[PDB]
Structures are given as C-alpha cells and as structure tokens.
Design a protein around this ligand. Structure first.
Ligand code: NAG
Ligand code: GLU
Lengths: 424, 61
C-alpha cells in the first residue's frame, strides 16, 4: 500500500518499529531512498530524481528559459520542486516566480495563485509538480479568469480525464508525463463482468455503482451494465500486480528455504520472522513480469535502495471535435519526441510559444549583465566610432577609421582636398 | 543628475545613467530636457530661462 507519498512516509515511520515489510506501488518521493530511516520500505516505481531531469530537458529542447513553478505542500511536491530547481540551474534556466498550494485552499486562494502567475508576463510557461485535485482546481480557476498558459505537468496530473473535465479550453495544448506501462488484457474482461448482485465481497462497490450509473438501489439499477459502456484502463494497474506478485515470490522463496519437506506451513515459518524476509528475500526477487505482452522483456527487481527503473512517456492534450490525449515521445537516459504530432509545433501553425526574460540585443548594441546573471541582460549601444568586438566589449575602431557595416571590422576613411570643380 | 534603469529580475539592484547637461530629472527613473532657451534648475526638476546676451560697453572688445 501507499499511493500518496505522505501516506507512505507516515505509515513507514510506524511499521519500522514492529519490523513489518512494506511495498508501495505509486509513491515516487525521493526521501524514501534513505535506508537509515526507512529501513523496511520498497517500491516498484522509480524515484522523482529522474522526473525532474526529464522535465528540465523538455524545457531546454524548446528554448524556454524563463519559467514559473507551482508546488503542492507536502513531501512529494516540495522535494520534486527542489530537485527540478537544482536540475534547471544546471542548464541555464531561470525561475520567474514560485507558488505553493496548501492542504486546505479555497477558490479565492486558487484565483490569487493564478493572478500571481500573471504578474510576470514574460514567463508564459507554468511548471506544475502537484497532486491531481490541486491541478483540477487550478485549471478551473484559470478557465474562470480567462487566462492562457502552457502547462508542463508531472505524473500527478498524468493522463486523467477527470482533471480536464469541463476545462477543455484552458487545458488544451498541455504537456504531461506518465510512467511507462502497458495494459493487461485479462483485467479488462474481469472488470467488465462485475455487477453489484454478485460482487458482494467488496463493501464499496454499490456506492461506486450508484455514482457511475446514477441510480438508487432503494430501484432502476439493473438495466445498466459495465459491458455496454467503454472501458479505459488506468495507467498504474501494472505496478499493483507487480507489487503483489513480488511479495508472493518473496514468501515462496522463504518457504522453500525454511520448510524443505512440506508444502504446508511449518513451525519455523509460523510467525514468518520479519527482519529476515526483508533483508534477504524481498530485495533479491527476480522473475518475468506476469500478463506482459509476449514481445516485451519486462522483469521485476529492486536495486540497493529498493527502487524501480526510470522510464517515462510524454503526452499532449489536443482537439480532434472531441478532445483526447496523444503520446509524442519518451525519456530513458535521453529525450526523444516527434514534433509532427504536436499541433502548435507543426509548421504553418505560427511561431512557437515563447518564454524568455530578455529579447536579443541589436547589431550595434552590447549586452550588460550584473556579475553571475546568466539569463537576463541590458542592451547598451556602442559609440558611433566603436565597433562591437564581442558581447560585452565595444572596441574603438581607430584614428581615421570607421566601423564596418558588420560592426566587426574597420575601414579607412577617404581623404579630402579642394577639388578642381568646387565653387571655391 | 543620474537616473535609474532597473535590471530585470532584481528590484534592489539598478543601473545609474547620467543625463545630458540640458536635461532635467522629472521623475526618479527618467529625465527630460528643458525647452530651447531654458536650462535645468539646480534641483534638476525645473527650467530657468537663459539670460539674453549682447555686447556691452565695458567689454575689452
Ligand atoms: C533553440 O535554439 C537553438 C540555438 O538558436 C536552435 O539551434 C534550436 O533550433 C532552437 N530550438 C527550437 C525548437 O526553437
Ligand atoms: N506518485 C504520486 C502518486 C500519484 C498517483 O497515484 O499516480 C505521489 O507520490 O503522490
């Protein structure tokens, strides 16, 4: 268990006292990699140390150097934004403004966050590293105030249709990142056959049925079926199955080690110890990932910190007149993306969206920055008799010399005399 | 006699730029020129009309 990083951290603090192993399926915070504190935790997903690299490299590809950031209060958002700021500095990218979203925020607070972004009109790109509900509310606020940004979001937004429901105009053209995965085909036929009359072991199914089909059992609920409506599988189904199978394999190997002569539990395994299972068997599992497509070679394993491997897919949101998510590239130790699929990146659409602090200087002018300012500059014109030697230097052309049209060279002035034709 | 042009990204820091002798500083960030025949006040906020000059009897010429 553990979907949100905050929940996983809080639960891990308690479980380490009683020596109970824990495997997560959706927690990607970097803090959990410190085994001096969380010495009983593992996960089947990569940490957020690589997602920041992927996002920063996406921004560099498009020459977007002035950007604003929005974060969610908590471990996940704060650690992710810190990592992204570190990675961005490395590539000469500067952050115009930073915003934070609290645990309890009213609509006026979201509108204030939106207005604060608009104070810096040069930075038209917003980098969100936030939970899904915060993203939904921020999109709604932007739709209300008729504001337009270019969104770059993490896996909290992912590719959920619920986030962009009713805010299609504001969300169009966004770019989001999701973990790389595939859909398994047995689960589709399993899920679509469930109905509340036979699925009695799940106590929460009837509430979901009522919300989904808009009916009340107290009648008119038996006409609906899940087969008639289309089914869209969620992205991280693969990771849950992988986590459950990893725990099962660890227990199976432990049983083979400790109870060699029987298939039933033996007395040695009766309390299943607990330090041994994590320190020896959980971290050493390796097997073929189940229900995978035959061509793939995915395997389940943990590194020294009990983490997964880092590979991601990249999506864009567009209008077809229905709206849909479209995959445009991937990241695995390097960015690859097809710019033909993105609408605004296509030719004849117009100039690319821009996000920069200072427009380039003129031919005769020179840049002036305070020491250590890599993004912003000031244009200072050179003297009429001086030519631009380099960016920060205006070099004197010389005596009797004039700067060239290129302003990077000198040519001698013509002499003057009293010509035979003058009125003098 | 100098004016401030702020460098973007840093409110505290600024650039000092000197004004031409015939211009006066109307506001903190910019200076305008007085009209022809007028010269900037010592405050560098107004204009004092220039005296009219002509040859006088007491001149050595
Ligand atoms: C970004 O800038 C570099 C240098 O001017 C240029 O070569 C590259 O084509 C630009 N990329 C885009 C997508 O604008
Ligand atoms: N990785 C997200 C969870 C989002 C999800 O459930 O897909 C987090 O750490 O909060």
């Amino acid at each position: 268990g553990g979907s949100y990083s905050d929940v996983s951290i809080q639960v891990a603090n308690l479980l380490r006292l009683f020596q109970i192993p824990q495997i997560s399926y959706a927690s990607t915070s970097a803090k959990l990699s410190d085994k001096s504190r969380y010495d009983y935790f593992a996960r089947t997903v990569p940490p957020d140390f690589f997602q920041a690299k992927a996002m920063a490299e996406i921004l560099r590809f498009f020459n977007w150097t002035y950007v604003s950031t929005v974060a969610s209060e908590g471990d996940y958002g704060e650690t992710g934004i810190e990592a992204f700021e570190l990675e961005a500095r490395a590539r000469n990218i500067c952050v115009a403004t930073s915003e934070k979203v609290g645990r309890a925020m009213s609509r006026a607070a979201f509108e204030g966050v939106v207005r604060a972004l608009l104070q810096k009109p040069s930075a038209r790109v917003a980098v969100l590293f936030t939970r899904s509900e915060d993203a939904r509310e921020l999109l709604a606020a932007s739709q209300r105030l008729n504001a337009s940004f270019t969104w770059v979001a993490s896996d909290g937004w992912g590719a959920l249709e619920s986030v962009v429901a009713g805010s299609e105009g504001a969300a169009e053209g966004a770019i989001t990142i999701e973990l790389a995965s595939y859909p398994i085909s047995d689960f589709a036929s399993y899920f679509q056959s469930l109905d509340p009359w036979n699925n009695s072991r799940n106590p929460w199914f009837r509430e979901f049925w009522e919300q989904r089909f808009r009916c009340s059992f107290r009648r008119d609920c038996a006409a609906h079926s899940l087969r008639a409506v289309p089914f869209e599988q969620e992205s991280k189904i693969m990771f849950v199955v992988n986590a459950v199978y990893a725990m099962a394999h660890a227990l199976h190997n432990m049983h083979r080690a400790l109870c060699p002569n029987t298939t039933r539990l033996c007395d040695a395994m009766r309390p299943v110890n607990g330090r041994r299972l994590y320190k020896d068997f959980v971290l050493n599992v390796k097997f073929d990932a189940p229900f995978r497509p035959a061509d793939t070679h995915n395997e389940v394993r943990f590194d020294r910190f009990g983490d997964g491997i880092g590979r991601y897919n990249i999506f864009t949101y567009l209008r077809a007149g229905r709206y849909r998510y479209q995959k445009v590239g991937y990241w695995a130790e390097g960015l690859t993306l097809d710019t033909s699929l993105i609408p605004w990146a296509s030719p004849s659409a117009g100039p690319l969206p821009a996000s920069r602090c200072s427009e380039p200087c003129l031919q005769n002018e020179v840049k002036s920055v305070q020491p250590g300012e890599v993004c912003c500059w000031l244009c200072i014109p050179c003297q009429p008799y001086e030519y631009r030697l380099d960016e920060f230097t205006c070099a004197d052309c010389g005596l009797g010399y004039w700067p060239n049209a290129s302003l990077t060279g000198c040519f001698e002035l013509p002499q003057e005399y009293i010509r035979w034709g003058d009125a003098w």
